[PDB]
């Protein structure tokens, strides 16, 4: 989605709900994750794609489910298979946890507004 | 470690 909480305003940390539209196409982000069960987060969205269009998550978003399957604790390779076969309409419940999803990218940390920096 | 990247 467009930009919507700027400068320094507190990025939102309750539950959303995102709908995505795209067909028979690629939803156009990537998931990482470690063992199952630590959480499966966004790593990064493509620019043009049917997330950056029709959806609004950010990298730090953990996955909490897909189409109503709860993937809070999914292996990586499952929560995978679901999110590319949940079919035309892709209904993601996400939260923001960039604590958590900065543990995997080198040199990278929380500011106080909640933002991911990576120095 | 034991990390893995897919896109989606």
Do not use: C, M, W
């Not at chain 1, 795209?22 to 939803?27: A, D, H, N």
């Amino acid at each position: 989605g467009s930009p919507e909480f700027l400068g320094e305003e507190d990025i939102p940390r309750e539950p959303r709900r995102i709908v995505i539209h795209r067909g028979s196409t690629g939803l156009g982000f990537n998931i990482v994750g470690t063992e199952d069960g630590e959480g499966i987060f966004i790593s990064f969205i493509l620019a043009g794609g049917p997330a950056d269009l029709s959806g609004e998550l950010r990298k730090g978003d953990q996955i909490l489910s897909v189409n109503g399957v709860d993937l809070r604790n999914a292996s990586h390779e499952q929560a995978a298979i679901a999110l590319k076969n949940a079919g035309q309409t892709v209904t993601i419940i996400a939260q923001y946890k960039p604590e958590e999803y900065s543990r995997f990218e080198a040199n990278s940390r929380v500011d106080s507004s909640g933002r991911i920096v990576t120095d | 470690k034991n990390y893995k990247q897919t896109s989606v």
